[PDB]
Amino acid sequence: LAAALACAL
């Protein structure tokens, strides 16, 4: 989930 956010932004 941390990575999900980083990628998205």
Short mmCIF file of N, CA and C in Angstrom, two decimals:
data_model
loop_
_atom_site.label_atom_id
_atom_site.label_comp_id
_atom_site.label_asym_id
_atom_site.label_seq_id
_atom_site.Cartn_x
_atom_site.Cartn_y
_atom_site.Cartn_z
N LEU A 1 0.79 -1.21 0.00
CA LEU A 1 0.00 0.00 0.00
C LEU A 1 0.84 1.28 0.00
N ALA A 2 1.95 1.32 0.73
CA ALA A 2 2.84 2.47 0.67
C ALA A 2 3.31 2.75 -0.77
N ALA A 3 3.71 1.67 -1.44
CA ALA A 3 4.19 1.74 -2.81
C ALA A 3 3.07 2.18 -3.74
N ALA A 4 1.86 1.69 -3.50
CA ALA A 4 0.73 2.06 -4.32
C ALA A 4 0.57 3.59 -4.43
N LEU A 5 0.68 4.21 -3.26
CA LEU A 5 0.57 5.65 -3.12
C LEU A 5 1.72 6.37 -3.84
N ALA A 6 2.94 5.93 -3.54
CA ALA A 6 4.13 6.52 -4.15
C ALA A 6 4.05 6.49 -5.68
N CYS A 7 3.64 5.35 -6.21
CA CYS A 7 3.51 5.19 -7.65
C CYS A 7 2.47 6.16 -8.20
N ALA A 8 1.27 6.10 -7.63
CA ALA A 8 0.16 6.91 -8.08
C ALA A 8 0.53 8.40 -8.23
N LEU A 9 1.29 8.90 -7.25
CA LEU A 9 1.63 10.32 -7.22
C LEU A 9 2.96 10.63 -7.90
#
